[PDB]
Amino acid sequence: SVTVKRIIDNTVIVPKLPANEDPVEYPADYFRKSKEIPLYINTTKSLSDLRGYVYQGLKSGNVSIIHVNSYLYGALKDIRGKLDKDWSSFGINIGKAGDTIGIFDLVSLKALDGVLPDGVSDASRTSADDKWLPLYLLGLYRVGRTQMPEYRKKLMDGLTNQCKMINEQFEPLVPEGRDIFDVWGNDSNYTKIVAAVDMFFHMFKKHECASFRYGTIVSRFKDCAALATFGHLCKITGMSTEDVTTWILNREVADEMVQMMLPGQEIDKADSYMPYLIDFGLSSKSPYSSVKNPAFHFWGQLTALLLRSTRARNARQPDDIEYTSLTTAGLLYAYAVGSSADLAQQFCVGDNKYTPTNAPPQGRDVVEWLGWFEDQNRKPTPDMMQYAKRAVMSLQGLREKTIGKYAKSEFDK
Amino acid sequence: SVTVKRIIDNTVIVPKLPANEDPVEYPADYFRKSKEIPLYINTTKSLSDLRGYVYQGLKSGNVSIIHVNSYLYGALKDIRGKLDKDWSSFGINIGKAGDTIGIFDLVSLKALDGVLPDGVSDASRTSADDKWLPLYLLGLYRVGRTQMPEYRKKLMDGLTNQCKMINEQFEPLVPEGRDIFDVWGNDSNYTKIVAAVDMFFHMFKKHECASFRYGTIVSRFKDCAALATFGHLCKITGMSTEDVTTWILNREVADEMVQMMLPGQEIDKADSYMPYLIDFGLSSKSPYSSVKNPAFHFWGQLTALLLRSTRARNARQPDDIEYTSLTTAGLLYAYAVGSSADLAQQFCVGDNKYTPDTTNAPPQGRDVVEWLGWFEDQNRKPTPDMMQYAKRAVMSLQGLREKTIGKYAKSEFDK
Amino acid sequence: QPDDIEYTSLTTAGLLYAYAVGSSADLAQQFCVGDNKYTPDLTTNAPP
């Protein structure tokens, strides 16, 4: 199939079609360039001054992102952090035993000359400061990413969070639309901060200030959907990481599973830069995204769903994947796990159970099952088709273009 | 299965996936560090003065937690407590026979210099004091933790409670939202207090003031769900603690059952610090939680439900557990207990039943091996009578909250 | 739906193509551990 001809006038035709590009970009395969993450917090002026520019600046449809950055740098050199271990990652060292280190031991620089207000922007504000204002400012990053009345949910809750210890209310004005402070996300030097906070308070999960993650947490494994719908597919079938891998039954799902598992990227690692590959700007196109792993994502999620997953009810159905193979493959995998439970005595009292056509295989072996499928004309049986029905009927509240909505339409009737 | 290869280009792939951490922390395995629970009630000023700062401070959308702490220390050195026994725990002694001791014989310290009002914050308040104000303040901790119109339920009731003996009425203003005085929970030195009160009035269940537990009680076994969904699974099947254990049929349920039963942690103990492991800050991650025991929790609860449990109707379905094995295992265990009742004559008059007198007929009593084997028999796959059993148990259920094991079971079995 | 095309042949041709892809999935073991399914092991009017 690498040469086609019109069987009427026997001429050559060359089936080609528009190229698609943007390759992925792995973390590690970039610390081969630079060896530091450059945080440009220009303008280093005055803390009390800064506390003002924003306290007020917030109360009004306008505050320079470049101000909030410097303010944050301000409150956050709570060096507070005793590295009771070691800490490297990709070559970069960060501290040794006992060593003390702060949030910004991840490489500070400075730059350009534009600044808006000067000195005292209303001296009003006291050092009710490193207590709650940094949190707010970070918290907003979380609310920035959102879409639906989860915004006013994400906020309403993410506002009773500063009330804690410090009981003091609200601030901006215009609800949202993905507009007001929703720009902050697009600020390279800002993300770079939320990522350092999160990554810091991941290491010192305990620290008094570690509550600062409230809106900084949706940065860890940002754009790493598939990579996480995988640890999910594992947890939900009890199967080993290695066994699950073998249950992959479609080329371009393998392709993508490969892509994600590329060695030397610190993914399995404790505390590493890998999770924030996106917000420290190590990668402009994540290789763990659900958009670069459509087949994987769809398959894993569909499967998890048939297996009674709550989460997966609402995963999105990617476009331009091969549906009636991903599904057929998900049905099998699910029906296997589903019909033959684990089951095996665990504790006892000297007395314990010595375990020992077209009847479907014993355990959860891919080859046993695959072969048994070959058997069934490589075409879904009625009990296994019935299985799918019980799993998806009685589902309710189904968003559209979800793998949840997909499954009910495919199996409930 | 510890080495995988692409069968097309015969290359190695190394299935790995993101690490998850936060280990648990057992109580005992910490009194290997410190040997006292440090209650920092700083600011030791004046009782009459304090009674004021808060009486008023409450009326108004603001009161320093650091005040209420000292106030409570204030009213509560009713030493009242004659230890008619002994009392140790984890090495720490607390008293001997006859010995007298107060709520705070659990280690008071002091500290930092920030204080808000000075002296007389309206001398108005009389010693209508160690009678009801401490209760309120504590009672609020309970209302703090809540989520739904159970708040205004928890309060409305937890307000006719001071009306006892004392008898008049309300104080703050703004309903809730998890905000007003809902911060108090996050105050290390505050929790440390509710825990001492509860633990004290657990020991002297009788004491005149022991009514102070009204909102201090949701501290005992806080974050110990699974550990308690287990004594439930026992009570509800009549089975022994040891027998129930054997009926565990999934690896990671055993795993967790182990985790929970780790020896030398005073869990089976009378009055111990173990229950308050969380609020005295002995542990930052409970090993008895339903979040660290998801499989156990789901299995035990699902089972209890099939067994006609009222409580379990509303337990929450954890995420990322292996559902169609936990369930299959729960169905069996339940069907076993369910179909073969205990039943056995107990009393008589010289005349009593000597109990003794085929295929795919399911086993006699409640033996794991007898049943397990009989399951092997049935193609290791749920029969129709046992599947019918599940249906009768879950149909006719109503008022089902979403994401509960109650809602789960009806959807899995009712149809 | 464009106009002035031959519908009951385009459709018939689309049905076939789709039914083919549809009924016979790809499916083929991808990863393993030394143990892997050697694929080889109906009659009339059984579709290809």
Neighbouring residues of B153: CB distance < 8 A, sequence distance ≥ 6:
none
Residues of A in contact with B403 (CB under 8 A): 310
Q: Is B228 in a helix, a strand, or coil?
A: helix
CA dihedral over B141, B142, B145, B147, signed as positive or negative: negative
Neighbouring residues of B147: CB distance < 8 A, sequence distance ≥ 6:
B178
Helix (H) or strand (E) holding A123: none
Taking the C-alpha atoms of residue B200 and residue B210, their distance in angstroms, rounded to an integer, is 8
Cβ–Cβ under 8 Å, residues A93 and A87:
yes
Q: How far is C48 from chain A (nearest CA, A)?
A: 11
Q: How far is CA B99 from CA B76, B85, B102, in A?
A: 18, 9, 10
Strands A4-5 and A108-109: unpaired
Q: Across the A/C interface, how many CB contacts are shorter than 8 Å?
A: 61
Cβ–Cβ under 8 Å, residues A31 and A92:
yes
Taking the C-alpha atoms of residue A277 and residue A126, their distance in angstroms, rounded to an integer, is 37
Which residues on neighbouring strands pair with residue B270, listed in sequence order?
Answer: none
Strands A39-40 and A12-13: unpaired
Taking the C-alpha atoms of residue A215 and residue A185, their distance in angstroms, rounded to an integer, is 12
Which residues on neighbouring strands pair with residue A95, listed in sequence order?
Answer: A87
Taking the C-alpha atoms of residue B348 and residue A298, their distance in angstroms, rounded to an integer, is 66
Cβ–Cβ under 8 Å, residues B389 and B338:
yes
- Partner-chain contact B8 C33, CB within 8 Å: no
Same fold, A36-218 and A221-412: no
Option in C21, C25, C32 nearest A246 (CB): C32
Q: How far is CA B385 from CA B228, B258, B336, B365, B381, in A?
A: 31, 33, 12, 17, 12
DSSP classification of residue B301: H
The position carrying tokens 């072969």 is A371
Cβ–Cβ under 8 Å, residues A187 and A65:
yes
DSSP classification of residue A355: -
Q: Across the A/B interface, how many CB contacts are shorter than 8 Å?
A: 158
Q: Is A100 in a helix, a strand, or coil?
A: strand
Q: Is B393 in a helix, a strand, or coil?
A: helix
Taking the C-alpha atoms of residue B390 and residue A67, their distance in angstroms, rounded to an integer, is 62
Q: How far is B63 from chain A (nearest CA, A)?
A: 10
CA geometry: angle at B21 spanning B16 and B23, to 5°? 140
| Chain A: residue whose CA lies nearest to B369 | A353
- Dig out the tokens for B219 from the structure: 């501290």
What amino acid is encoded at B247 in this protein?
W
Residues of B in contact with C33 (CB under 8 A): 1-4
- Partner-chain contact A325 C25, CB within 8 Å: yes
Give the best residue of B1, B3, B7 to mutate against chain C (max C CB count within 10 A).
Answer: B7
Q: How far is A97 from chain B (nearest CA, A)?
A: 20
Taking the C-alpha atoms of residue B315 and residue B303, their distance in angstroms, rounded to an integer, is 12
- Dig out the tokens for A236 from the structure: 């939900």
Cβ–Cβ under 8 Å, residues B182 and B29:
no
Neighbouring residues of B311: CB distance < 8 A, sequence distance ≥ 6:
B232, B304
Q: How far is CA A53 from CA A72, A119, A166, B83, B394, in A?
A: 12, 9, 21, 61, 61
Cβ–Cβ under 8 Å, residues A159 and B177:
no
Which residues on neighbouring strands pair with residue B95, listed in sequence order?
Answer: B87
Neighbouring residues of A334: CB distance < 8 A, sequence distance ≥ 6:
A302, A303, A306, A307, A387, A388, A391
Taking the C-alpha atoms of residue A278 and residue A113, their distance in angstroms, rounded to an integer, is 27
What amino acid is encoded at B378 in this protein?
Q
Question: Residues of B comprising the binding site?
Answer: 142, 151, 205, 213, 285, 316, 401
- Dig out the tokens for A191 from the structure: 């993300």
DSSP readout, C14-48?
Answer: HHHHHHHHHHS--------SS---------TT---
Taking the C-alpha atoms of residue A53 and residue A82, their distance in angstroms, rounded to an integer, is 33
DSSP readout, A19-54?
Answer: --------STTTTTS-SS--EE------HHHHHHHH
CA dihedral over B292, B295, B297, B298, signed as positive or negative: positive
- Dig out the tokens for A157 from the structure: 């809750």
Residues of B in contact with C31 (CB under 8 A): 4-7, 13
Residues of A in contact with C31 (CB under 8 A): 245-246, 248, 254, 257
Q: How far is C42 from chain A (nearest CA, A)?
A: 8
Q: Is A234 in a helix, a strand, or coil?
A: helix
DSSP readout, A178-237?
Answer: S-SSTTGGG-HHHHHHHHHHHHHHHHTTTSTTGGGGGGTGGGTTTT-SHHHHHHHHHHHH
| Chain B: residue whose CA lies nearest to C37 | B7
Residues of B in contact with A254 (CB under 8 A): 6, 8
Residues of C in contact with A370 (CB under 8 A): 27, 29, 37
Size of chain A, expressed as the number of residues it contains: 413
Whether domain B36-218 has CATH 3.90.180.10 = no
Rg (CA), chain A: 27
Taking the C-alpha atoms of residue B37 and residue B278, their distance in angstroms, rounded to an integer, is 12
Cβ–Cβ under 8 Å, residues A189 and A41:
yes
Q: A236: closest CA among B294, C32, B412, B376?
A: B294
Strands A4-5 and A12-13: antiparallel
Question: Residues of A comprising the binding site?
Answer: 142, 151, 205, 213, 285, 316, 399
Other CB atoms within a 10 A radius of the CB of residue A68 amount to 26
Q: What are phi and psi of A232, to 5 degrees?
A: -85, -50
Cβ–Cβ under 8 Å, residues A269 and B19:
yes
CATH architecture of B221-414: Orthogonal Bundle (1.10)
| Chain B: residue whose CA lies nearest to C29 | B7
Cβ–Cβ under 8 Å, residues B87 and B93:
yes
Other CB atoms within a 10 A radius of the CB of residue B115 amount to 14
**Can you give the residue ranges of every domain in chain B?**
36-218, 221-414
Q: A190: closest CA among A116, A146, A137?
A: A137
Residues of A in contact with B412 (CB under 8 A): 308, 390
Neighbouring residues of A386: CB distance < 8 A, sequence distance ≥ 6:
none
Taking the C-alpha atoms of residue A340 and residue A361, their distance in angstroms, rounded to an integer, is 9
- Dig out the tokens for A115 from the structure: 């600044």
What amino acid is encoded at B282 in this protein?
L
- Partner-chain contact A249 C41, CB within 8 Å: no
Option in C24, C25, C41 nearest A329 (CB): C25
Cα A355 off chain centre by:
42
| Chain C: residue whose CA lies nearest to A242 | C32
Which residues on neighbouring strands pair with residue B39, listed in sequence order?
Answer: B108
Give the best residue of C26, C29, C31 to mutate against chain B (max B CB count within 10 A).
Answer: C31
Taking the C-alpha atoms of residue A259 and residue B6, their distance in angstroms, rounded to an integer, is 12
The position carrying tokens 């476009």 is A319
Residues of B in contact with A267 (CB under 8 A): 16-18
Cα A38 off chain centre by:
23
Taking the C-alpha atoms of residue B397 and residue B299, their distance in angstroms, rounded to an integer, is 19
Size of chain C, expressed as the number of residues it contains: 48
Other CB atoms within a 10 A radius of the CB of residue B228 amount to 13
A163 class by beta-carbon count within 10 Å (0-12 exposed, 13-18 middle, 19+ buried): middle
Strands B4-6 and A12-13: unpaired
Q: B8: closest CA among A85, A41, A412, A248?
A: A248
Q: Across the B/C interface, how many CB contacts are shorter than 8 Å?
A: 17
Q: B200: closest CA among B329, B350, B389, B37?
A: B37
Cβ–Cβ under 8 Å, residues A222 and A279:
yes
Q: Is A266 left (phi over 0), alpha (psi -120 to 50) or beta?
A: left
Whether domain A221-412 has CATH 1.10.10.60 = no
- Partner-chain contact C27 A250, CB within 8 Å: yes
Long-range contacts of B21-25 (CB under 8 A, 24+ apart): B21/A270, B22/A205, B22/B285, B23/B285, B24/B259, B24/B283, B24/B285, B24/B286, B24/B287, B24/B292, B25/B282, B25/B283, B25/B284, B25/B285, B25/B286, B25/B287
- Dig out the tokens for A282 from the structure: 């190590």
Option in B17, B323, B380 nearest A307 (CB): B323
Residues of A in contact with B381 (CB under 8 A): 339-340
- Partner-chain contact A248 C31, CB within 8 Å: yes
Preceding-residue numbers of gaps in chain C (C–N over 2.5 Å): 41
Option in C29, C30, C33 nearest B3 (CB): C33
Taking the C-alpha atoms of residue B136 and residue B211, their distance in angstroms, rounded to an integer, is 11
Q: How far is B259 from chain A (nearest CA, A)?
A: 14
DSSP classification of residue B13: E
- Dig out the tokens for B307 from the structure: 């067994």
DSSP classification of residue A360: P
Option in C24, C31, C37 nearest A371 (CB): C37
Strands A39-40 and A108-109: parallel
Experiment used for this model = X-ray
Helix (H) or strand (E) holding B66: helix B65-75
- Dig out the tokens for B266 from the structure: 């005073």
Q: A222: closest CA among A193, A195, A255, A184?
A: A195
Q: Is A87 in a helix, a strand, or coil?
A: strand
B65 class by beta-carbon count within 10 Å (0-12 exposed, 13-18 middle, 19+ buried): middle
Q: Report the b/e string of C12-24 with b at 16+ CB within 10 A.
A: eeeeeeeeeeeeb
Q: Is A402 in a helix, a strand, or coil?
A: strand
- Partner-chain contact A377 C32, CB within 8 Å: no
Cα A91 off chain centre by:
24
CA geometry: angle at A183 spanning A182 and A187, to 5°? 130
Option in B1, B3, B7 nearest C30 (CB): B7
